[PDB]
C-alpha cells in the first residue's frame, strides 16, 4: 500500500548506483512497477518498466543501454542499476506501481521516493497553459495536446492526468480519458475529444493546487507532458 | 408435522388462493405484445450486421 | 380433527385447481397464430475459453457484459474477457466443489458455493490489488445450488436444504429465511426490479416468493420430475423452469398456470440450464446429450440446435444487452455463441 | 500486431495466468482424491482417526502420496443430486459394520446403499475399497447369536470364517460389474494400524490400473 | 502386364491405407482435448515417422520393382538409401522409448509421472532421433568416400556397405538386436509387474505378447536373411531379396493400428474426429 524508494545521494559523473523501493503492503509480484524521474524544475520523464515475471522491459530514449531495471519477488524490493550517470541525469525518483487489466487503473500510487545529484517519432504533449491564475470556487480547465490521435481502434483513449501538491508525491486522478480514479473527488471530470484534451474543475479547493501532468500510455516511451501551475 | 404443519398449510394455501388471477387470454397477449415490441433490440433473433458485431475476430 | 384439517386442504387444492381450470381461457400456441415464425437459427462460435483444467459448473455475466465468471471442478474460479480472449483474475477456492458463481450487477463483487454449505463472496476493486473474501456467509445446512446478487449489501441463496435465504454482506446472517419447499432447491432468478424470484425445488414445484415481506406469494406446479433452472422472462412476469423431463415449462404471475411445453420426442435427457435470449423470442436449454436449443418461446416449434460441445453441457445464459451466449460445459471450455 | 501497449500487457499477465493454472493443474491431478462413502457413525470416525457443517477433507500424505479423504457422508441432503460432482475419484472407500445386522433392518439397508453406489452410472470404472469393522464386536455377536436372523438365503453354520467368507461373497456380488471395476475387501478392527497400508496397496493397485488404460496397454 | 499392373494396384492401396492411418492417429493428439498428454508425443513421434514412410518410402521403393533393375540415378538412389534406413530405425527407437515409457510406468506408477514433464519427453525424442541420423544417414557416404570408387553398381542398388562382415554387423547389432533384446525383458518384466481380476491380466500380457510378436515377424525375417549375405552373397536373387526387405514396412504399416486398437480412447474417439469435422 506504501511505496518507499530508497539510495542516492551525490555520486561523481559516470559512476554507477542501484536503487531500490521497499514495496510492503501490495501484490508486489502481480503488479508491474515502473520508474519516473523528476528533474529540480522540469517535467516527469519516464525511465524503464517492468511486468509481472520480468516478462516485458521497456527504457526510455536517454537510458537504453545505461540503466538496467529488475525485480527481487521473494525480496519485495525492486532495483534500477546505473552505468555511466551523465550531468544530466540528476533527480529525484518516483517508484511507481501498476496494473493492466481490462478495467484496471495503473500509475495509481506513486512512491515518496529519493534523490539522486551528479556533479559536473515520439508521442509530443504540449501543455500550453502554464502558472494560470484561478480563484477558489470557480470553474476552470487544464488543456493539453498530443499529435498522434489516442483514440485507439479498441475504443478506450489511453491517456492520463497526474496532479501533484507541492513536496508531494504525485497522484492518479484520470487512470483513463473521461474517468475517475478511487479516491478522487467526482469535481474532477475528464472532457475531450480526438486529440485535444480538457480537465475540468468543478470547484477546486485550498488543497486540489499544483501542476497536472498529462501522460500518454499508447506506446512507449510514456511521452509525459509538460503540465500547468495552479495558483491562489 | 403434526403439531403445526396442517394449520401452517392451511393458511399458505389461503393466501394462495386470495389472490386475483387474471384470464389467460389476456396474461399470453401481454406477454406477446413484448416479444414484438423489443424485436430491434434482439441482435440473437434476428441477423445483427457483421458491422457492428463486436465477437468478430 | 387433524384428519378434518388435511381433506379441508386438500378440498382447497382441489378449489383452486377448479379456479386455475376456469381461470384458462386459450392456449398460448392457439393465441400466437397468425404470427411469423423464426426459422432457422445458426448462431456461430465466436470465442472459445480454453483456460480451465476440470469441469465446469456456473456462469454470470456482468452489467456491461463483457466479464465472464466460471465456476469449475478445481477450484479455479476464473473472470474471463469476452471481446478478446485474456484472463482478468484467477481465483484459487477454498473448496474445489463449487456448483455456482455470480458476479455483481456492479462488477465490484463475485461470489461462489458449493457442497462446503457456505458462500463465499470476493472482492476485486481492492487497493493492494487481490481477490480477497468479503465474507464468508454460513447458516445453511446442506449444499449451495445458486446464489444471486441483488445489491453490493444482500445476496439470495437457494440451498441443499428446503430452504432459500437472503443474506447480509455486512452482517454475515441471514435477514430472511424463505421456506415453503419440500426436498432440495435447485435454481432461482431474480426479476428484473429485484423485487420478486422464483425457487425451483426437486418436488416439481416453483414458488413465488417476496425479499421483503418474506412469504412466498405463488405456487407452480404442473410438472412430472425435478426442476434445474429457471430464468424469469425479460417481462419479469413469466419464468421458464429447467427440468429432467426435458420438458421446459412456461409458467406466468397473473394467470398462475402453465402456458407452453418445449417437448419433443427426439430428446430424453435432462435439462441443465435455461436462460431466456433478450426480448424473450428465444428460450435457450442446455440439456444432458452434449446439446443446446434455441427454442422459440411463442411457437413450440424448435428454432435452431446448438451444439458444439463434447461432453454435458451444465450452464448458459445471453449476455445483458442480447449480444451472445456463453455456455459453460463438462469439459474445460466456454463457448461464446453469436 | 496492432494491440495497444496496454492490451500487451493484459495479454502477458493472461498468458502468465495460463501458466499458473498449469503449473497448479499439473501439480494437483497427479494427487489421490479418496471418497469415502457409506454408513456415518458406524466406524467412519474409527477409520479417520487411524491415519494421524458439510463435506470435510482430509490431506494426510503416506509412504510419499497425498491423499485426499473427502467425507460427504455427513451432507444429509439428496444424495443423488451431488453424488456427480465426485467422478473422477480414484476410489470409493465404502463402510460397513459386521455387528449392524440386528437393528427395515440397517444391514440391508447398508446392502441397498452399496448396491446403489456400485451400480451408479458415475462410477462404472473407479474402483471400491470396502471395509469391514467391528472384528472383535462381531465375533462377540457370531458367538452370542446365529447369522441366519438377518441372512434367510444363508443356511451354513455359525461359524466367524464362513460368516465372513459368505459375507465377502454377499457385498462382492451385488456388484452386476465384475469386468470394469474390483472391490477390496478387508476385515480391519477398531485397534488397528495396518489400514493405511492395506489402502496404499490398493490405490497402488488402481492408479496402475489407470496407468494402464491411459497408456492404452490394456 | 495386366497382372502386374494390379499387383501395383493393391500395393498402392495399402500404401494409401498406411497413409491415411498415419495422418489419422496424427493429427488426434492436437485436435483433441483430452488427448493432450505427453504420454502420447511418443506416438505423435511415431505416427510422424510413419507418414514419412507412407508419403515416400513404399512407392520410390516398388519403382525398383517396375521390371527388376532400379531406373532412377545413383544421387538418387543415395538420398533413398540415407533416408529410408535412417527412419526405419528412428521408428524402432520410438518403440523403444514407448517401451521405456511404459516400463517406467509400471515400475513406479507415481513417481515416474511426478518427475517425468513435457521437456524431459521432448529432449529424449530429439536425442533418439539425431542419434538413429548421425549412426544411418552419414555412414553410407564415409564408407562411399572411403573406398573411393562404386563397387555396387547403381543398376541394382542397395545399402554401399555388406561385403565387408564387420561393418554391417556392428550397425545392424545396434538397429535391431539390442532393441529387440530391451524390449522382450522389459515386456516380460512388464508382464510380471501387472499382477496386481486374474484373467485380464493374462489377457493383457495376451495382447503385449501379440504385439512384440508383430514387431518380431515384420522386422526380425529380414535382419535374419541379410546376416547371410556376408558371407553367402549367392543365396536368394534379388527380387525376393527384395520382398524379404519390403516386409519390413508392414510394421509402419501396422503400427497406427496395433497401437490405437488396444487403448479406449482410440477406438472411440477415431470416429469423432471425423464426426464433427
Ligand atoms: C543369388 O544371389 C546372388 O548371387 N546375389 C549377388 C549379389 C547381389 N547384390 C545386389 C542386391 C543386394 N540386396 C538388395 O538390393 N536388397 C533389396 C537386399 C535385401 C536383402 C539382402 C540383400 C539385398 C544384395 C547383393 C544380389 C544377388
Redesign the interface.
Known sequence: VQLVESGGGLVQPGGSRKLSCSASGFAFSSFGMHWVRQAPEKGLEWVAYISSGSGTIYYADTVKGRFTISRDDPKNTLFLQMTSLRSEDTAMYYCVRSIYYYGSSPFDFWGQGTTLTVSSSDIVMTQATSSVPVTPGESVSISCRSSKSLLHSNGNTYLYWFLQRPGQSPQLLIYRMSNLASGVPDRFSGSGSGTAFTLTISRLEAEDVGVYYCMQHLEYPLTFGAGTKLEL | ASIAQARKLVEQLKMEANIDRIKVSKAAADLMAYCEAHAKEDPLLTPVPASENPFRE | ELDQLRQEAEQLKNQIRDARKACADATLSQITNNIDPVGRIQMRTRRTLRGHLAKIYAMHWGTDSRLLVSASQDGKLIIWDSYTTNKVHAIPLRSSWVMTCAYAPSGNYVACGGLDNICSIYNLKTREGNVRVSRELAGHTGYLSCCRFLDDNQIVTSSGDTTCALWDIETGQQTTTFTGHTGDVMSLSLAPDTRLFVSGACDASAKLWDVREGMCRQTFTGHESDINAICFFPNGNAFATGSDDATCRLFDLRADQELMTYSHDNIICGITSVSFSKSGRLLLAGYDDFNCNVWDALKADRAGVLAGHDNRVSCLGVTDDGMAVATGSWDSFLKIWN | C?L???????????????R???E??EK???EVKLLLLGAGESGKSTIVKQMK???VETHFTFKD?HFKMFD?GG????RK??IH?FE?VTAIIFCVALSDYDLMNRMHESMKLFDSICNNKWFTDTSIILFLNKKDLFEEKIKKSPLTICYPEYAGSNTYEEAAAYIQCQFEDLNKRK?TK?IYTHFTCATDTKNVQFVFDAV??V???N???????? | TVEMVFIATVTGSLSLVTVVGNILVMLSIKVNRQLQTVNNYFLFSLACADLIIGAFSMNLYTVYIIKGYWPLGAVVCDLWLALDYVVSNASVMNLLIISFDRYFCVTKPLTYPARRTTKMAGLMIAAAWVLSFVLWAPAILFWQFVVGKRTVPDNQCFIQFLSNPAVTFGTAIAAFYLPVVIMTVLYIHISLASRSMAARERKVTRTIFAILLAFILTWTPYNVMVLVNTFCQSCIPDTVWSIGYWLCYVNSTINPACYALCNATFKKTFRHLLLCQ
Open positions: 496492432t495497444s501497449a496496454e492490451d500487451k500487457a493484459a495479454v502477458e499477465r493472461s498468458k502468465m495466468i495460463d499458473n493454472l498449469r497448479d493443474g494437483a491431478a497427479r457443517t458439510g463435506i502420496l460427504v451432507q444429509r441432503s439428496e443430486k451431488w460432482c473422477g469386468d474390483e497402488t493397485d492408479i496402475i490400473k496407468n494402464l488404460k491411459d497408456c492404452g496397454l490394456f
